Coordinates of C-alpha atoms in Angstrom, one line a residue:
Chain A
X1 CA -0.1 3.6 9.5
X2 CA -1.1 1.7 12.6
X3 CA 1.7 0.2 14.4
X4 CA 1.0 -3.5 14.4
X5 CA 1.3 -2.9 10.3
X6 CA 4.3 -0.6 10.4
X7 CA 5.7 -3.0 12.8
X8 CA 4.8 -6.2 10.4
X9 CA 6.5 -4.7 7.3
X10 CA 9.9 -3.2 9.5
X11 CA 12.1 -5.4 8.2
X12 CA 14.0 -4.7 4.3
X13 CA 12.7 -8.3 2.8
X14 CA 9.9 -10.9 3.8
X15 CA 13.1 -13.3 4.7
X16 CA 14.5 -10.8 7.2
X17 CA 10.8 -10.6 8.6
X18 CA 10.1 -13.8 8.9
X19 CA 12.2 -15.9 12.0
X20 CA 15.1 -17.6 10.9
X21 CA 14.1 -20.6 11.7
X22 CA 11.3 -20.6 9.8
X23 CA 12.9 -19.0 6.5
X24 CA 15.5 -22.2 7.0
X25 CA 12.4 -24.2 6.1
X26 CA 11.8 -23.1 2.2
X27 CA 13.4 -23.8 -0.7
X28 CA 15.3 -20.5 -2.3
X29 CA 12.7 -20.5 -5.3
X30 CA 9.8 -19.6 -2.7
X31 CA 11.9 -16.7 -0.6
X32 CA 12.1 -14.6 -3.8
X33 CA 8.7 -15.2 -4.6
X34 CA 7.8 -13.8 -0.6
X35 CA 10.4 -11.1 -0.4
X36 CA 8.3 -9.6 -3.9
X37 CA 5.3 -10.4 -2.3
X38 CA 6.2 -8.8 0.9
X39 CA 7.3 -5.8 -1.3
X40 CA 3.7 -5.5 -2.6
X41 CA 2.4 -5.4 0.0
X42 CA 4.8 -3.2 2.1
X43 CA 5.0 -0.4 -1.0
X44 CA 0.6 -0.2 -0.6
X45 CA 1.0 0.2 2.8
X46 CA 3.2 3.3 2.4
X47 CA 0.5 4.4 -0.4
X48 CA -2.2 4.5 2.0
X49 CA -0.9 6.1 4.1
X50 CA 0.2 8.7 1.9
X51 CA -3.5 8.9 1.0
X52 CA -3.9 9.5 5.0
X53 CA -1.5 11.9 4.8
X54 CA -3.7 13.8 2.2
X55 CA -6.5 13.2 3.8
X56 CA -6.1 13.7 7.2
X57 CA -3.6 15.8 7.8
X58 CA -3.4 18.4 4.7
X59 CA -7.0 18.6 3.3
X60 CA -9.1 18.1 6.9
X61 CA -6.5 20.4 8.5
X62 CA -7.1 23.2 5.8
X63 CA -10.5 23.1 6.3
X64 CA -10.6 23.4 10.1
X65 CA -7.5 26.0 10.3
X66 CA -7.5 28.5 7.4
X67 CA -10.0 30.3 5.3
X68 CA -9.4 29.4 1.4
X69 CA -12.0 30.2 -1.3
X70 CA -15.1 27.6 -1.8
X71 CA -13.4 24.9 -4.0
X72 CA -9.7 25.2 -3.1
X73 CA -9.6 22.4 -1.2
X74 CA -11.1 19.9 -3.7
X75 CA -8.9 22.0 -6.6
X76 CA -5.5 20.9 -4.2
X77 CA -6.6 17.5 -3.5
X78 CA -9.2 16.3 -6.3
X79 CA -10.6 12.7 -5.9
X80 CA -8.9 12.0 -2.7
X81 CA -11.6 10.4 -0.3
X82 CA -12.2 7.7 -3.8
X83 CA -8.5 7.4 -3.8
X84 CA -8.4 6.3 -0.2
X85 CA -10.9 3.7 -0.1
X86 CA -9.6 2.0 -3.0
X87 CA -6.4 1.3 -1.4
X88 CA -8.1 1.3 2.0
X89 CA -9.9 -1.8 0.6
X90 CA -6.8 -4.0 -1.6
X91 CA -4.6 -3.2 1.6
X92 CA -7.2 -4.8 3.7
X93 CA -7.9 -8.3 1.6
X94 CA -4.1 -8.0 1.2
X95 CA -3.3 -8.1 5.0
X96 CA -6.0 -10.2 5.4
X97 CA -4.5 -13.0 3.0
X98 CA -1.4 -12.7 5.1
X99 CA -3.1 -12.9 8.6
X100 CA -5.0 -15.7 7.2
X101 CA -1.7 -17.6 6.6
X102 CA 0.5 -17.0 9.6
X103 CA 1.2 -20.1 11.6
X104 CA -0.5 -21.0 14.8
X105 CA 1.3 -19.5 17.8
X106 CA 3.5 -16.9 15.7
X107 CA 2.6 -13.2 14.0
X108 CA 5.3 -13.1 11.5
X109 CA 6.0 -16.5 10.0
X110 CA 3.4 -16.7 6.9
X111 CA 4.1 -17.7 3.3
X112 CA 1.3 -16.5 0.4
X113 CA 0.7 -18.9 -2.0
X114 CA -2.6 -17.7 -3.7
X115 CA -1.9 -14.0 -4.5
X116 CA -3.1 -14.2 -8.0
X117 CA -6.9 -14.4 -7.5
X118 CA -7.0 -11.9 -5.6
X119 CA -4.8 -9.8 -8.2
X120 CA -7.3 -11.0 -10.5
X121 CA -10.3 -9.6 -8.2
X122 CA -9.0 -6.3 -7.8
X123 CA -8.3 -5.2 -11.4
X124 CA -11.5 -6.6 -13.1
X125 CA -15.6 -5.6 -12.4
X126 CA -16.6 -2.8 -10.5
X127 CA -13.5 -2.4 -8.7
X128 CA -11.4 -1.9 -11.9
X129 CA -14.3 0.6 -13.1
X130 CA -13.8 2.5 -10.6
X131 CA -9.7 2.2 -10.4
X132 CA -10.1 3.3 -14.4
X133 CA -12.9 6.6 -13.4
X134 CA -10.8 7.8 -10.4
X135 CA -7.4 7.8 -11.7
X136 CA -8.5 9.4 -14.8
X137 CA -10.1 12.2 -13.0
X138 CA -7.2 12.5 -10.5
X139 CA -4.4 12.6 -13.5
X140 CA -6.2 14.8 -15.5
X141 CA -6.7 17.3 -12.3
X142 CA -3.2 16.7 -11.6
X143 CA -1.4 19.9 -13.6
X144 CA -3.8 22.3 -12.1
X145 CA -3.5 21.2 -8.1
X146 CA 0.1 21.7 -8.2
X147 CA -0.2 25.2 -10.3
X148 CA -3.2 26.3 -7.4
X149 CA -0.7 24.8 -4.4
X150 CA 2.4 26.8 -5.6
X151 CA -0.1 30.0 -6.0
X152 CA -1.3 29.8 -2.4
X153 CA 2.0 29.4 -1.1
X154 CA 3.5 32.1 -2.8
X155 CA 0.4 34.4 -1.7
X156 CA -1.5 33.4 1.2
X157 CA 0.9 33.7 4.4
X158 CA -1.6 31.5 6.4
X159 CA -1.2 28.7 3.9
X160 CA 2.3 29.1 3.9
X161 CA 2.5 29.2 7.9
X162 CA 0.2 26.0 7.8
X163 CA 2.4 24.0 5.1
X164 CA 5.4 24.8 7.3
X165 CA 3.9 23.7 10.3
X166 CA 2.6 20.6 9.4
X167 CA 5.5 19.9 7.2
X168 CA 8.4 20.3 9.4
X169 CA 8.3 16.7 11.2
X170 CA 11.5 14.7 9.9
X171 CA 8.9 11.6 9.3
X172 CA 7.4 14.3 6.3
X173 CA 10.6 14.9 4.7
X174 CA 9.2 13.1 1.7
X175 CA 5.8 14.3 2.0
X176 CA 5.1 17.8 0.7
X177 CA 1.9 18.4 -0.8
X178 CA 3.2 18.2 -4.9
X179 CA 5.1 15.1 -3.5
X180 CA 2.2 13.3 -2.5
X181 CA 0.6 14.1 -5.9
X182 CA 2.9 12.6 -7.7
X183 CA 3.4 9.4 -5.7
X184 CA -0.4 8.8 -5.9
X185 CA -0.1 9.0 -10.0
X186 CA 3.2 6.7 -10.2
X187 CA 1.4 4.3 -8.1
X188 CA -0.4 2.7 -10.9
X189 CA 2.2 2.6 -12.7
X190 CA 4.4 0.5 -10.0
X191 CA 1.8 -2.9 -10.4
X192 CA 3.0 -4.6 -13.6
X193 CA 6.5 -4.1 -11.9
X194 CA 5.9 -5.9 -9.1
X195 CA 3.4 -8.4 -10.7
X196 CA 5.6 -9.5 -13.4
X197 CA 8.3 -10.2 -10.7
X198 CA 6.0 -12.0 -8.4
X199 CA 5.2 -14.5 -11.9
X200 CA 9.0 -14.5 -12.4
X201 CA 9.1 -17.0 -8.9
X202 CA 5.7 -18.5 -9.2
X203 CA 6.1 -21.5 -11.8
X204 CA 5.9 -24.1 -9.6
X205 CA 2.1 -24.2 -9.1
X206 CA 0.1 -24.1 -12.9
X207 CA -2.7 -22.3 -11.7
X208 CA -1.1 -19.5 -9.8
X209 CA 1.3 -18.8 -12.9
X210 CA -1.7 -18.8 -14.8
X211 CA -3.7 -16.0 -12.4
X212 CA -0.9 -13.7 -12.6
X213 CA -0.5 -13.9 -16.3
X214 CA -4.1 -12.9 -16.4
X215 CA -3.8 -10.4 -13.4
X216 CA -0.5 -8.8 -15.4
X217 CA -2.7 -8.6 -18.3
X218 CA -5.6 -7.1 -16.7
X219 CA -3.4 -4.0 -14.8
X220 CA -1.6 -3.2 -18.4
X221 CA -5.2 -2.7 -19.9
X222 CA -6.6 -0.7 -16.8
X223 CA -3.1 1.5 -17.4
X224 CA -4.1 1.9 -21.1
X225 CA -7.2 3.1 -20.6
X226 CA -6.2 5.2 -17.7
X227 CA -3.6 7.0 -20.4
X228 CA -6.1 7.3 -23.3
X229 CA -8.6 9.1 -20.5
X230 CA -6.3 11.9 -19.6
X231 CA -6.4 15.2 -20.9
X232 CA -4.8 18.3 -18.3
X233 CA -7.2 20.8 -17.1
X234 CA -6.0 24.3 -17.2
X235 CA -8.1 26.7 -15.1
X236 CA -9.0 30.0 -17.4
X237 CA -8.2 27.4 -20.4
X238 CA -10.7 28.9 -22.8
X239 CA -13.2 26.6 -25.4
X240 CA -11.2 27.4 -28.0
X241 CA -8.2 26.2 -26.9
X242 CA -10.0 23.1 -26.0
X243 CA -11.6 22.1 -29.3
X244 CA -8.0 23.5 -31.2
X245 CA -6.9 20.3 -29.1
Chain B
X1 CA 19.1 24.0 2.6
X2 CA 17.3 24.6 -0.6
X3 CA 15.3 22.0 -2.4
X4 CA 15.7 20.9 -5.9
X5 CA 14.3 18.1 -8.0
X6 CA 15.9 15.4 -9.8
X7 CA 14.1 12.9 -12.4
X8 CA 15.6 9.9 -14.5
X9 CA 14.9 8.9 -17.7
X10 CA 15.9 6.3 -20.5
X11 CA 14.9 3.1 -21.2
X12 CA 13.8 -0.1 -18.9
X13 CA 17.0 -2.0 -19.2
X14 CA 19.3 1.4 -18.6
X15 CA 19.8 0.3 -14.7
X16 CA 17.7 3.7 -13.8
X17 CA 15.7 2.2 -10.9
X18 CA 19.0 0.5 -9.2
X19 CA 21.0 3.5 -9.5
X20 CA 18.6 5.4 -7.6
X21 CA 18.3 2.6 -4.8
X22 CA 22.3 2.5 -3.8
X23 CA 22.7 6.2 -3.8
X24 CA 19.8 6.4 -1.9
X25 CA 20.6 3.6 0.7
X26 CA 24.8 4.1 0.1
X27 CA 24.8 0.4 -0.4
X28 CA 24.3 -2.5 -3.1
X29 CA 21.2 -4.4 -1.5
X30 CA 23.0 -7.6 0.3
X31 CA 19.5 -9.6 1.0
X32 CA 17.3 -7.9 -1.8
X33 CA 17.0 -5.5 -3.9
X34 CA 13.9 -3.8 -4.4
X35 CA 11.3 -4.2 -7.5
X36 CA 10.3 -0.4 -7.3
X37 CA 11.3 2.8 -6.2
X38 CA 8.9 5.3 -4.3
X39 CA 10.8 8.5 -3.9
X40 CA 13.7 9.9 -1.6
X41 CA 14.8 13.3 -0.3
X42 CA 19.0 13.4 -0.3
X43 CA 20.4 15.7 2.0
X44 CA 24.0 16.8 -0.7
X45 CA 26.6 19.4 0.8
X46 CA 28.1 19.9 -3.2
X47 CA 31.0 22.9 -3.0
X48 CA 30.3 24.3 0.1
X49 CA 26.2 24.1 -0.6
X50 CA 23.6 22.4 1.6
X51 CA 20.7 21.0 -0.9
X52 CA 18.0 18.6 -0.2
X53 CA 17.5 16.6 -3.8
X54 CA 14.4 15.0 -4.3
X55 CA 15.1 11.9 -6.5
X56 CA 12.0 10.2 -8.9
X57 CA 12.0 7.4 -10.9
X58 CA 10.1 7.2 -14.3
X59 CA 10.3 3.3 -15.0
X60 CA 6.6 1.7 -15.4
X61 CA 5.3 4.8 -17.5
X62 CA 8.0 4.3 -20.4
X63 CA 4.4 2.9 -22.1
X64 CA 1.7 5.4 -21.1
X65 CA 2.6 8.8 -22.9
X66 CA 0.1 10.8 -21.2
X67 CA 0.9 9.3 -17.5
X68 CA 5.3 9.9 -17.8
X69 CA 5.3 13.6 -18.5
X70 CA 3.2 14.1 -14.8
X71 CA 6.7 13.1 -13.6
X72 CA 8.5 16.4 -15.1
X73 CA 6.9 19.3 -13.8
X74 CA 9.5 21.9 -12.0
X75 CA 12.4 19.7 -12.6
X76 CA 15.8 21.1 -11.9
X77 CA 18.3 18.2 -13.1
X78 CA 17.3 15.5 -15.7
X79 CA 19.6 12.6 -15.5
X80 CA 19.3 10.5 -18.7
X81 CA 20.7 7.0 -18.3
X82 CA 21.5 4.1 -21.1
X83 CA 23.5 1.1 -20.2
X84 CA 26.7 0.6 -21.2
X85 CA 25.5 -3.3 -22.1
X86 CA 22.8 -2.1 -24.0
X87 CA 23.6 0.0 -27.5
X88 CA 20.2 0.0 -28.2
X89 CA 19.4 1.8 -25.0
X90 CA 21.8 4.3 -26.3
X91 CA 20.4 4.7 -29.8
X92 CA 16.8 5.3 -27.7
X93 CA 18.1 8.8 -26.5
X94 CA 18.4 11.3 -29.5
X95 CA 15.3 11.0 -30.8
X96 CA 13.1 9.3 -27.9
X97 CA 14.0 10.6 -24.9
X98 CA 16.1 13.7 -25.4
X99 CA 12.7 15.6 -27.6
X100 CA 10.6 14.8 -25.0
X101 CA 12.9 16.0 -22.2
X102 CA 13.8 19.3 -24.4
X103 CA 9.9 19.8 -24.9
X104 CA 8.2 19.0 -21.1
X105 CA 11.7 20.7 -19.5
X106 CA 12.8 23.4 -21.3
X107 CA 16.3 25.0 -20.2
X108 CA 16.4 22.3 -17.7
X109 CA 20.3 20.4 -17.3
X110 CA 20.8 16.9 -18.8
X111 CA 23.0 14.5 -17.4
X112 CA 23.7 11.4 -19.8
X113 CA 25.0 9.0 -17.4
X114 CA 26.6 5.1 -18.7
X115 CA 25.5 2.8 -15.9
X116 CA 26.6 -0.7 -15.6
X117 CA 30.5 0.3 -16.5
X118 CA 31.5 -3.1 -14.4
X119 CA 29.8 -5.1 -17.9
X120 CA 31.9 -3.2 -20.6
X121 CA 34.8 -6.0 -20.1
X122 CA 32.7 -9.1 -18.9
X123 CA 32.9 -12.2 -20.8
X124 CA 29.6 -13.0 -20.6
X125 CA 28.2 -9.8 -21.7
X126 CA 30.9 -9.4 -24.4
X127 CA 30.0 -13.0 -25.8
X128 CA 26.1 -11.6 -25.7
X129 CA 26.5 -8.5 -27.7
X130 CA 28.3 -10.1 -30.1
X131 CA 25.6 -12.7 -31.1
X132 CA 23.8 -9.5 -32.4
X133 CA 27.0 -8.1 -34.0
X134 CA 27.4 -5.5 -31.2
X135 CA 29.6 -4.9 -28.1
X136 CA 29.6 -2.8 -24.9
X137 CA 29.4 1.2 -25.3
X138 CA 33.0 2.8 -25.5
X139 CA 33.4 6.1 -23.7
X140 CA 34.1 8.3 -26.7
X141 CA 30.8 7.1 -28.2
X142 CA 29.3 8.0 -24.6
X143 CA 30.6 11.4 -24.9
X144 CA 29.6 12.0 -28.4
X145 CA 26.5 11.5 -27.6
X146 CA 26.3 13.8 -24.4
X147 CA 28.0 16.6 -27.0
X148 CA 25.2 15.7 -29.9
X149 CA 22.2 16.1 -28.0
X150 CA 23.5 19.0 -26.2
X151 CA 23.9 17.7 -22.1
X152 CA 25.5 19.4 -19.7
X153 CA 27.8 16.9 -19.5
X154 CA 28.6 13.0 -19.4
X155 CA 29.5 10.6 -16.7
X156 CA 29.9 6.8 -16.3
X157 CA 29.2 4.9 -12.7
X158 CA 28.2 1.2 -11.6
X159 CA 25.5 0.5 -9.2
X160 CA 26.9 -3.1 -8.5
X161 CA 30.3 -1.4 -7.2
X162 CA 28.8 2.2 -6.3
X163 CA 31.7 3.6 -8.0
X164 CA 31.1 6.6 -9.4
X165 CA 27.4 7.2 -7.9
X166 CA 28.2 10.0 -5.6
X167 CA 29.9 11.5 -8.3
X168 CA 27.1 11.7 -10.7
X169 CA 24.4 13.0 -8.0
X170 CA 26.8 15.1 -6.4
X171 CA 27.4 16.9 -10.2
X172 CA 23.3 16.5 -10.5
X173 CA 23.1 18.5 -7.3
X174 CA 25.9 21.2 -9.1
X175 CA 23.6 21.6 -12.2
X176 CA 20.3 22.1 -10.6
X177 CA 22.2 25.2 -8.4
X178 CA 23.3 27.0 -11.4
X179 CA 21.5 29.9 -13.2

């Protein structure tokens, strides 16, 4: 993350971000809905930059450091450049909605009232097309990256040296390799959470109840389809056990 | 200091994600307490032992059967939670959960763990239960189920309180080092 951000989403809850003096300023019903809000956006944050993480340091630093086998480093990290400019792109229009609202004269005092349509954009057209292709592939490859990872590690004493190395850093401790790959595929599964929570506090304006219902709605069936899509690969599986399925 | 890996399971209303949070924090949330749950790496020093325990979370993927079982692979120490307001999310474990935990984790330890103890003598709660012709969970039907579905053993804690949190992940951290 970039330090402005990091900086921005410091604090536990939007209410001990904000200055008091503003929070003093809005009803309790409107703090809950901002503290999940904030929580959103805070938690996608952290997601992208576990996709930099990937990105960045593990795959591009395999490449430029050891000598693996053509197809290694796509088999560790499969789909992660797609991945990463997903999220690269919500985080964005998310940070932007808050930047937009900030008051005149401050950097942290901001409420979000319109987070649904923008919910609503993200999980429908194109962008949920691709959401639905990427996380299929990535879940479905997910089985045989941490089988290939454990492999090298136990084998290659470069690798090993390399994981080490770039693992020892106390701000990794929950960043290993098989830990990133399974934060990426809860992810998805962290929206309807948060959604449903964000509706929980946002009655007081028709419409935006209304565009999170349909958001909510429009996550669960991206999740379904995501589920019906998956099916582990298993390298050296063989046909047979394939069409035995 | 070795590494093992801990996952939860049971139902939505089980008090899973919230147990997670105040071990991990040592503290009930004063201002808020979070939605979600992204992961955690406890440093436990159990009987002399250094361990660092990596803690997951399952809730959000009780509805996508091919998504939740990404969660289990080399898994040292399941703890399976119901809530001791909820009989339902007792009845959920020896035919729902504890299968799919047996089939995805084989030989693997099992935990069952009663959060929410505080609620077994609340009014409110009491009152509740009632309404459907049920009350809180008593221990020996805790314990009977632990035995039935063949866990390692039982224990009972409250997130609200903390008491008996560090017991239960300190045990976790116990199972996971044995052979």
């Amino acid at each position: 993350s970039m330090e402005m951000d990091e900086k921005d989403f410091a604090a536990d809850s939007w209410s001990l971000a904000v200055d008091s003096s503003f929070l003093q300023q809005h009803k309790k019903e409107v703090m809950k809905q901002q503290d999940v809000i904030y929580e959103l956006i805070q938690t996608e944050l952290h997601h992208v930059r576990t996709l930099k993480i990937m990105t960045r340091l593990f795959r591009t630093g395999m490449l430029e450091e050891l000598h693996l086998e053509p197809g290694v480093v796509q088999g560790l990290f499969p789909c992660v450049d797609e991945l990463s400019d997903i999220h690269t792109r919500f985080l964005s229009q998310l940070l932007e909605r808050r930047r937009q609202a900030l008051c005149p004269g401050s950097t942290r005092n901001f409420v979000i009232h319109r987070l649904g349509d923008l919910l609503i954009s993200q999980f429908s057209g194109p962008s949920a097309e691709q959401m639905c292709k990427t996380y299929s592939e990535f879940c479905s490859r997910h089985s045989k990256a941490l089988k290939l990872y454990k492999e090298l590690y136990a084998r290659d004493k470069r690798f090993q040296q390399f994981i080490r190395k770039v693992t020892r850093p106390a701000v990794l401790k929950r960043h290993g390799v098989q830990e990133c790959i399974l934060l990426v595929t809860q992810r998805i599964t962290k929206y309807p959470l948060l959604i449903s929570r964000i509706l929980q506090h946002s009655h007081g304006i028709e419409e935006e109840r209304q565009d999170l219902t349909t958001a909510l709605g429009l996550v669960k069936e991206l999740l379904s389809n995501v589920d019906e899509g998956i099916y582990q690969l298993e390298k050296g599986a063989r046909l047979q056990e394939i069409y035995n399925r | 200091a070795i590494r093992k890996k801990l996952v939860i399971v049971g139902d939505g209303a089980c008090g899973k994600t919230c147990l997670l949070i105040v071990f991990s924090k040592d503290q009930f949330p004063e201002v808020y307490v979070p939605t979600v749950f992204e992961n955690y790496v406890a440093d436990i020093e159990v009987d002399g032992k250094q361990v660092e325990l990596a803690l997951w979370d399952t809730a959000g993927q009780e509805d996508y059967d091919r998504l939740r079982p990404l969660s289990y692979p080399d898994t040292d120490v399941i703890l399976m939670c119901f809530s001791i307001d909820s009989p339902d999310s007792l009845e959920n474990i020896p035919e729902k959960w504890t299968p799919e935990v047996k089939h995805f984790c084989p030989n693997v330890p099992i935990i069952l763990v009663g959060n929410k103890k505080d609620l077994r003598n609340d009014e409110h709660t009491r009152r509740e239960l009632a309404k459907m012709k049920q009350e809180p969970v008593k221990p020996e039907e805790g314990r009977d189920m632990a035995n039935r579905i063949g866990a390692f053993g039982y224990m009972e804690c409250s997130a609200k309180t903390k008491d008996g949190v560090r017991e239960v992940f300190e045990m976790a951290t116990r199972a996971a080092l044995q052979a």
